[PDB]
Amino acid sequence: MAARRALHFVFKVGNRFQTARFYRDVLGMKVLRHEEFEEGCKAACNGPYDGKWSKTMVGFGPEDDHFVAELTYNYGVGDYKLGNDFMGITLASSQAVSNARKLEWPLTEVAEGVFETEAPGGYKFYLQNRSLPQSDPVLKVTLAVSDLQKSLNYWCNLLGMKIYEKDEEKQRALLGYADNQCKLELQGVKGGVDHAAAFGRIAFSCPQKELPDLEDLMKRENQKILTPLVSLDTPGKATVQVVILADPDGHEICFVGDEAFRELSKMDPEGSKLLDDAMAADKSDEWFAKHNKPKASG
Ligand SMILES: [Cl-]
Ligand SMILES: [Cl-]
Ligand SMILES: [Cl-]
Ligand SMILES: [Cl-]
Ligand SMILES: [Cl-]
Ligand SMILES: [Cl-]
Ligand SMILES: [Cl-]
Ligand SMILES: [Mg+2]
Ligand SMILES: [Zn+2]
Ligand SMILES: [Zn+2]
Ligand SMILES: [Zn+2]
């Protein structure tokens, strides 16, 4: 097998209704889990939405054997300016292509049988017009880098990702922890990496014993640690441990202990209905409207 496993990409969601509809009705993905969070407030809670946020996992199957989207919704935040850091997710589905066509959701053929589309927020998805394969339709996430060799030294020498493809001349590498996982594509881009406000995070699992040594290695090597090892709670569900890191271009990386994460990430059959009930009950847009002020921007 592999110790380390590609889990998900965090997407900052302005409009949850429109995001849920794109992921269900265009990509043909499903709700795996839905969790409503309340952080409370440092000072007096300003409005009924302060510290209130949701996490919805969407993808083609259980998180154990699929790479999925972590839809992060803050009830008080309505827009995120998208930079050039996240270049898209590529997946194989003629079903998604048909869905887009039937729903008149714009599609652009960028190579033979490959259709570029945009989720709400401008996040790019690349749809291969071929049959749903006999496993996870998600093939890769592509991230922009300023200095390819600097990025390979980080992602390969420090984090232990294998090189499936490397092209110095095209300034591109395809990395992965295993054949049966989502791959990470690094693409040298023009004009620097800009994270703006929509910047997400790529999550991997390792055995929990590796978390403190992963933190130490990054300290020793002078790499950025965004969040030292910490326990994160989810209402009515397992506590996991995370270290949050920053690659050489500042892409956020989450490492989480696999053994407890597998208890947290059980596919919840009620997830879809919990999302629909929370959306039916979300009057945040009407609240901000009556207060004559917008949701914050990322
Ligand atoms: Cl669903
Ligand atoms: Cl009020
Ligand atoms: Cl599968
Ligand atoms: Cl699947
Ligand atoms: Cl994460
Ligand atoms: Cl997570
Ligand atoms: Cl009100
Ligand atoms: Mg008014
Ligand atoms: Zn599957
Ligand atoms: Zn996550
Ligand atoms: Zn009011």
UniProtKB/Swiss-Prot annotation:
It is found in: Mitochondrion. It comes from the Eukaryota. The modification N6-succinyllysine is found at K273. Keywords: Mitochondrion, Phosphoprotein, Repeat. GO terms for molecular function: cadherin binding. Expression is decreased in hepatocellular carcinoma samples as compared to adjacent non-cancerous liver tissues from the same patients. Transfection in hepatocellular carcinoma cells and overexpression can inhibit the cell growth. PANTHER family: GLYOXALASE DOMAIN-CONTAINING PROTEIN 4. This is Glyoxalase domain-containing protein 4. It comes from Homo sapiens (Human).
